[model samples]
Target chain A: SHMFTGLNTPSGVAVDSAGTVYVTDHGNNRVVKLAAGSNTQTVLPFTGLNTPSGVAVDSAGTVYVTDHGNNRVVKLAAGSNTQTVL
Target chain B: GSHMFTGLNTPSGVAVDSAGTVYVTDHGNNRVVKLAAGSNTQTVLPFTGLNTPSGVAVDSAGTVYVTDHGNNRVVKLAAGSNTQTVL
Candidate 1:
């Protein structure tokens, strides 16, 4: 059941309350989102992202990701692509 | 702030519920363990057939979802139930 493509060395995955799945495309230095029941991927563009290791979503649908290569955590808000370094 | 619970064998993914109950995937043990809020004792959820479990998540309803990495399956354990369902 391969529901995604164009992912380069994808790692840790998390799903939000709405069922949208976020995947760490490690090799590509980006995070990809797969909407519920859909195969299309939307890339989340952020500056200084490197080898993201893990992802988690909170009750409010905010995304938290560990930037393994950068040694920092980045937070993404619900319905927004802006990155907030934490 | 460090809290320790016993019987975790190579614990992997973890998630915390709104109530602060901690859910951890014991990868080597092939099960998920739940530590209730403010409790030290742990309860191993009935996931008798998991293989190299990895990521885990708890939805708003407290339903626990696990990523059985080695088995290539996603399973769900409903709140207050031990039964497992392939999701």
Candidate 2:
């Protein structure tokens, strides 16, 4: 038995090799991750995002997200909150 | 490689395949696109009746998945096939 609750306007999802599922909470302008065997969602350290609509994780563990409100794509390198606008 | 995207109207979703191909849902344009890894070339995927698609994902086998928001359908486009399946 499973349920979907919490998270406002979740627009996209991505799963890493470690089984961490990343989801974009669109209306909240944030991204959250749920680990393989955990039920809690941890919010990533992203600041100043307006309507994040999409997210992707590559083989290198780098995270990418589309900031629809700013009409830009941003990248989150491993182990940092410094976002690079692509 | 960092991709400098320009001239897109209301782009929505993004997904990367195992091969590094990035797929995007061009919501405003009502189409989906793919970008080869380390390349700037943009190729539009063959998708139809997609009004405001907002979500996209790629599996390990390269099959692409999307949420057709406007049509209220979850659609998938398998690799090497031009046909899209609604699930």
Candidate 3:
């Protein structure tokens, strides 16, 4: 399905328990959330997400991302949008 | 919430379902394992024929998607089923 658009060189994708899909927009240097049943996507604003690759969502709805360029992992909590290095 | 189980070889990707069951792609082992919640033991999913499995994803319905890296294809395993279909 063409549910997602404007993704460039997208690398990693993950879906939360709530069906919110998170994708690492590799070419865009950021992550975006496509909430289930929604047409628009919310770009997750964060710094230090250099060349992000893999993405995963935990049971708590927390988002985990791998920064391939920076050699680190990032965590984004549900609803709060707080980014933490893990 | 830390526990360990042996027999994994070069585990590459991981995913979790709504029930807190963990799915791991044992790359070198050419299969996937499901680690249930509240248990250290794991059961190998019927992904034995995969080659160099790399990435894995689980949807809200518990359906699993695995990237058969070596085989250059994607495989989907429906929830509660061992059978796989190439995508």
Candidate 4:
């Protein structure tokens, strides 16, 4: 119920099964996650992302991002920085 | 817009349906696309007059809703229909 600051030109939003909210901080070139009951947001472990625009979480909790600048989508396993181009 | 549909350029919004069909709004290119389950390449949706579409959603019935940024309106394309109507 509090205002979320530090988000720069946020673009897309997604929610995982565990109530974790994922957001694409487009201008900041990162994705953020807000735990279902937590008030603060945590930045994800994604690197080399250029103006990420969209984020989605699959049923298996895998995260996907659409990098607007790089012109591709990437898949990341739960809590892993390793990304495979999709 | 690229008529050849080679790859995505500056895509912004994305939504996945129950069937795992993923929808994306290709912002800079003024187009929307969907990737069927187990498919990597994108199949462009039959939408025209979209200007910098930025957000997308798919309902249980497979209806797609788009936030057309440049057009300053939200639009929807239902199943069995190829065109979008302002909503």
Question: Any residue pairs clashing in model 4, and if so which?
Answer: none
Q: lDDT of model 4 at residue A1?
A: 58
Q: What would the per-residue lDDT of candidate 1 be over residues B14-48, giving only the tens digit for each residue?
A: 88877999888888888888888666568888875
For residue B3, model 3's alpha carbon misses the true position, in angstroms, by 25
* Comparison by DockQ, 2 against 3, better one: 2
Q: For model 3, what is the alpha-carbon lDDT of residue A14? A: 77
Candidate 3 accuracy as TM-score? 0.57
Computed on alpha carbons, the lDDT of every model, listed in order, comes to 0.75, 0.80, 0.75, 0.80
lDDT of 1 by residue, A1-86 (tens): 34555555454667787877677766678887777667567887666898887788887988889999999999988878688999
After TM-score superposition, the amount by which residue B48's alpha carbon in candidate 4 deviates from its true location, in angstroms, is 2.2
DockQ ranking, best first: 2, 4, 1, 3
- Report the lDDT tens digits of candidate 3 across residue range B1-87: 245656789987888776988898888888878888777677777764688676688996787876565664456687778778654
Candidate 4 CAPRI assessment class: medium
Candidate 3 per-residue C-alpha lDDT over A1-86 given as tens digits, one digit per residue, 9 for 90 to 100: 33455656555667777767677776678887777577677899667788787888888988888998899998888877579998
Could you tell me which 10 consecutive residues in candidate 3 chain A have the lowest summed lDDT? A1-10
Model 3 preserves the real interface contacts to a fraction of 0.19
**Residue B87 displacement (Å), model 1:** 5.6
lDDT of 2 at B78: 86
lDDT score for residue A28 of model 1: 76
Instruction: Write the residue-wise lDDT of candidate 4 on A1-86 in tens digits.
Output: 54356889987888977888888898989988887886877877876899998898878777778888888777677868788666
lDDT of 3: 0.75
DockQ of candidate 1? 0.19
Can you list the residue pairs that collide in candidate 3?
Answer: none
Chain B TM-scores of the candidates: 0.88, 0.85, 0.87, 0.84
